[PDB]
DNA sequence: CGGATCCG
DNA sequence: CGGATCCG
C-alpha cells in the first residue's frame, strides 16, 4: 500500500462508513456506522498515514467467525492479504492508487479496551503496560487482567478506562 | 493467495530454483549454492498435493542473515513478497501462468539438522516429540536443543543423528506422524 | 507490551 | 510445541 494524507484517510473512512457489510450464511448483513470506529494513526491525527485502521464493534460473540472472513465493501475494489476473526488486512483501490485498509473486531464489552489498544501509539502502550505489569496486571485489547482473571472495571468509555487504570487522560494526538 | 500444486509440479519448481537463487549484499549479487538449498515441508514428506513449496537456505555466516531473504533474487522468475524477514520470507511466484506460494526459510550451519527436523514436520509429529522432551525439562526448536535456556551441545551432523540422539525412532519424512 | 495469524 | 512477522 501507498502512503496517504490525513484528509485522504478521512475521505476513505467517510466513504466506507455506509458501505461495510458481511455475509452470514448467504445473507448480507450491513455493518452500522455507529459500530465503525476510526483508530490507529488516523485517530491520532498524524499528517501522513501508512494505512487506514477501522475497529468494527460486533454485537454477538457468535458473529466473530463471520464478520471479517466474509467482509464486503460496496463498490470498492479490494483484495485480502491476511484475514481471521480479529484482524483482516485489505489492499483497496482508491482513485487508481492502492492503499492498505486494516480491519479489527471488538465485542461490545471489549470496546473501551480495544479503542485504547488500537489508538496507540505503540511506544505509549508499551509504557502503560510496563507500569501495570509492575503491579501484577496485564492489559490488552480485551480487558484488564490479574492472575489470568478479568478485573471487572465499572467503565464504559476509553476516557473512563484510562483514568480508572491510574493514568492521565490525553487526547489521541497527544499520546506519545 | 497461491494455488495448490501436485508433487511433481513442486519438484519441477525446486529443480528450477536450485540454480537461480541469489541475494544482494551491499550492491553485490551473491549466488546461493544448490548444496545450501534443502527441500522441506510437505514436498520433502512426498505428499501428493502441496499447499506451497518450502525451501530451507543454509547461510554460512551469522552476519549474512540480515541480507539474504530481505534482498532475495530469483533469476528469470516473476515474484512478489508477501511477508519477509531474516528467517521467513513468503513469496508468490508465477509458474506457467499460475500463482503459487514459495516459503523460504534460513538456517545457520550449526542449526542445520534442527532446522531440517523442524521444517520437515508434520506439525502433529513435532508437537508429540516436543511434548515428550518438555516432560524431561528440554526445549527443542529449529535452532537447537535447550535445557534451562542453555544450548545442549549435541555431537551430531545430520537429521538422522539428531533424531536418534534425542531418543526417538528414525522414520523417513513420508512416514512421520 | 501483548496478541493475531501464520510457519513447520 | 515453539517461533516469525506483523498488528496497535
Ligand atoms: Mg495503522
Ligand atoms: Mg494499520
Ligand atoms: Mg508447506
Ligand atoms: Mg510453506
Numbering used by the authors:
A (entry chain B): -1 to 174
B (entry chain A): -2 to 174
Paper text:
To provide a molecular basis for designing better drugs targeting polymerases, African swine fever virus DNA Polymerase X (Pol X) was used as a model for the study. As the simplest DNA polymerase identified to date, Pol X belongs to the polymerase X family and is constituted of 174 amino acids. In this chemical reaction, metal-ion A (MeA) is a catalytic ion and decreases the pKa of 3′-OH, facilitating its attack on the α-phosphate of the incoming dNTP, and metal-ion B (MeB) stabilizes the dNTP-DNA-polymerase complex and increases the electrophilicity of the phosphorus center. To clearly understand the phosphodiester-bond-formation mechanism and the metal-ion catalysis of polymerases, we designed modified dNTP substrates with a chiral α-phosphorus center (α-P center) using a single selenium atom, without affecting the overall and local structures, to explore the absolute configuration inversion and probe the mechanisms of the metal ion–oxygen interactions.
In contrast, when using DNA-II (with 3′-OH) and dNTP (dGTP, dGTPαSe-I, or dGTPαSe-II), the DNA extension reaction took place to form DNApost, and the phosphodiester bond was formed (the after-reaction state, with the bond formation), followed by solving the absolute configuration of the Se-atom-modified P-center on DNApost in the product complex (the product-template–polymerase complex: nat-dG_pro, dGSe-I_pro, or dGSe-II_pro). The 3′-OH attacked the incoming dGTP or dGTPαSe diastereomers in the crystallization conditions, thereby generating DNApost and forming the native and Se-modified product complexes. Similarly, the Se-modified product complex (formed from dGTPαSe-Sp) generated extra and very strong electron density only for the Se atom on the P-center, revealing its Rp configuration and indicating the two-metal O coordination. Further, the configurations of polymerization products (using dGTPαSe-I and dGTPαSe-II) were determined as Sp and Rp, respectively. Based on these structural observations, the Se-modified P-center configurations on the two dGSe_pro structures (synthesized from dGTPαSe-Rp and -Sp) were determined as Sp and Rp, respectively, indicating the P-center inversion. Though one nat-dG_pro complex and two dGSe_pro complexes belonged to P212121 and P21 space groups, respectively, their structures with the polymerase were virtually identical, especially the two dGSe_pro structures (RMSD: 0.2 Å). In addition, the complex structures of the three products generated from the native and Se-modified dGTPs were virtually identical, and the absolute configurations of the Se-generated P-centers on the two dGSe_pro complexes from dGTPαSe-Rp and -Sp were determined as Sp and Rp, respectively.
